Curated annotation (Swiss-Prot), chain B:
It comes from Homo sapiens. Its main location: secreted. It comes from the Eukaryota. Keywords: Acute phase, Glycoprotein, Protease inhibitor, Secreted, Serine protease inhibitor, Signal. This is Alpha-1-antichymotrypsin. The keyword Glycoprotein applies. Belongs to the serpin family. One of its GO terms (molecular function) is serine-type endopeptidase inhibitor activity. The keyword Secreted applies. Glycans are attached at residues 46, 59, 80, 139, 224. Alpha-1-antichymotrypsin can bind DNA. Plasma. Synthesized in the liver. Like the related alpha-1-antitrypsin, its concentration increases in the acute phase of inflammation or infection. Found in the amyloid plaques from the hippocampus of Alzheimer disease brains. N- and O-glycosylated. The reactive center loop (RCL) extends out from the body of the protein and directs binding to the target protease. The protease cleaves the serpin at the reactive site within the RCL, establishing a covalent linkage between the carboxyl group of the serpin reactive site and the serine hydroxyl of the protease. The resulting inactive serpin-protease complex is highly stable.
Length: 33, 336
């Protein structure tokens, strides 16, 4: 079984489900700020 | 149309923000920034105007200023839907100095195209003006953005404001009881302890990008919105960032296929960022608007206004039940 673990820097992009567009975008390098 | 420009703009802006602070979290809304600038371009003329539209990544040969503002109008009409478990709202406002004369055309275009409210502000009482704008934003972002405006020149003539509030629930929520303190690697040898949420045996859109050394997964929200997560391999972030292009996003989304995931771990966190976008905008070609040659005569009929500063405040909350994201952009405009 595959495991996806977000325990290192990642990108999060909030997009509409049926449209190629970007509402919000973030790079989380440190979740503790 | 507008979507294509927005994605291009989003990635261009992103790369500039990273260059400014390569070690910090990046949090922003292309939409909030684009909207505020397009709103401002309503009163711009000649080169000032051209630069803004070109800076917003619009192909002025394939689209006209008229089409652009229409796209923003429809966009605003569409977005404002805070009901079906998903709350999404966006508002525009202009705080203008008491007794400053604005062209009727500008005010009308602002109301019908940007749904902008207009508030007469006494910019001479800086402390009062600040609170008014900040309270408007606080109200609009349900309490998330509290201090968008930290200071104002006593020479401020007006401030354009845009805010976006988003609150959605995961289609597949995380059980708080499965959240445990675990390591988040800042670097290969350094880490912090954070609440790591988890989900077991879930089928979601997935794509392992072997070419770019990253994994892409999509976690849908209840409504017409999803969160795309891109996990670069250890030390591959910069490589992925160098490839953040509209064609890359499209390729990723088109390559997504449903796959059974044994386990998924995602940190629970609340982060915020404060930005002075002057440097970034200048780097994107928006220059004249900030100089003595600023041509914003479409606002009052005379070239007596220039942008002094564009700020952006962002907040992101990711937790078991869903996500809350708030953004706000302000364009401070002074006398020229």
């Amino acid at each position: 079984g595959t495991i996806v673990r977000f325990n290192r820097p990642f990108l999060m992009i909030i997009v509409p489900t049926d449209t190629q567009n970007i509402f919000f975008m973030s790079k989380v390098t440190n979740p503790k700020q | 149309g507008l979507a294509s420009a927005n994605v291009d703009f989003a990635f261009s802006l992103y790369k500039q923000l990273v260059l400014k602070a390569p070690d910090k979290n990046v949090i922003f809304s292309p939409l909030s920034i684009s909207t505020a600038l397009a709103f401002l371009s309503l009163g711009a003329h000649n080169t000032t105007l051209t630069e803004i539209l070109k800076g917003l990544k619009f192909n002025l040969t394939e689209t006209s200023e008229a089409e652009i503002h229409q796209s923003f109008q429809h966009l605003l009409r569409t977005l404002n839907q805070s009901s079906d478990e998903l709350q999404l709202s966006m508002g525009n406002a202009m705080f203008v100095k008491e007794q400053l004369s604005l062209l009727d055309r500008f005010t009308e275009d602002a109301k019908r195209l940007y749904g902008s409210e207009a508030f007469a502000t006494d910019f001479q009482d800086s402390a009062a003006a600040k609170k008014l704008i900040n309270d408007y934003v606080k109200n609009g972002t349900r309490g998330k953005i509290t201090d968008l405006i930290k200071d104002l020149d006593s020479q401020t003539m007006m401030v354009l404001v845009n805010y976006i509030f988003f609150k959605a629930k995961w289609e597949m929520p995380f059980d708080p009881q499965d959240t445990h303190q675990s390591r988040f690697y800042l670097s290969k040898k350094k880490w912090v302890m954070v609440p790591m949420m988890s989900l077991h045996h879930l089928t979601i859109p997935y794509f392992r990008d072997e070419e770019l050394s990253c994994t892409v997964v999509e976690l849908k929200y209840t409504g017409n919105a999803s969160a795309l997560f891109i996990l670069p391999d250890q030390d591959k972030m910069e490589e992925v960032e160098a490839m953040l292009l509209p064609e890359t996003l499209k390729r990723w989304r088109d390559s997504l296929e449903f796959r059974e995931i044994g386990e998924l771990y995602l940190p629970k966190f609340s982060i915020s960022r404060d930005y002075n976008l002057n440097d970034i905008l200048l780097q994107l070609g928006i220059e004249e608007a900030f100089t003595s040659k600023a041509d914003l005569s479409g606002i009052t009929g005379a070239r007596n206004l220039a942008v002094s500063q564009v700020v952006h405040k962002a907040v992101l909350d990711v937790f078991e039940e869903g996500t809350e994201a708030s953004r706000a952009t302000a364009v401070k405009i002074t006398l020229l």
